[PDB]
Design a binder for this molecule. Structure first.
Ligand SMILES: CC(=O)NCc1cccc(Cl)c1
Length: 121
């Protein structure tokens, strides 16, 4: 149907916007602490602690498969990256501190992204 095509065009445009957002958020992780899944070889007990692991590479896979239907779903995954890290790692670690900085700097990006998704529809 034409409606389905129209829908798919919207999803494609959302994906385009979210790809820009993801690039901007990952730029706020210059240490690449969140670039890849936490290694279950280097941290064999990780899944005993964290029930829903997330990282930028995994988000990017879902993104390019057009797997985010709305901004909320994308934000859920971004928040997992930060929240998982702030539980597994103590306050006095470069890991926890990187998550705080990513959350703080990311807020600006996500604030405008929400306005853009709304405005453009
Ligand atoms: C994102 C995150 O939580 N990283 C913690 C961590 C993973 C692997 C090795 C060390 Cl030393 C630390």
């Amino acid at each position: 149907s034409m409606e389905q095509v129209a829908m798919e065009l919207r999803l494609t445009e959302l994906t385009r916007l979210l790809r820009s957002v993801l690039d901007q958020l990952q730029d706020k992780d210059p240490a690449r602490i969140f670039a890849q899944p936490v290694s279950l070889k280097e941290v064999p007990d990780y899944l005993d602690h964290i029930k829903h692991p997330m990282d930028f590479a995994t988000m990017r896979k879902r993104l390019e498969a057009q797997g985010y239907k709305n901004l909320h779903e994308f934000e859920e995954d971004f928040d997992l990256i930060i929240d998982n890290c702030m539980k597994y790692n103590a306050r006095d670690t470069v890991f926890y501190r990187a998550a705080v900085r990513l959350r703080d700097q990311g807020g600006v990006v996500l604030r405008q992204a929400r306005r853009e998704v709304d405005s453009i529809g």
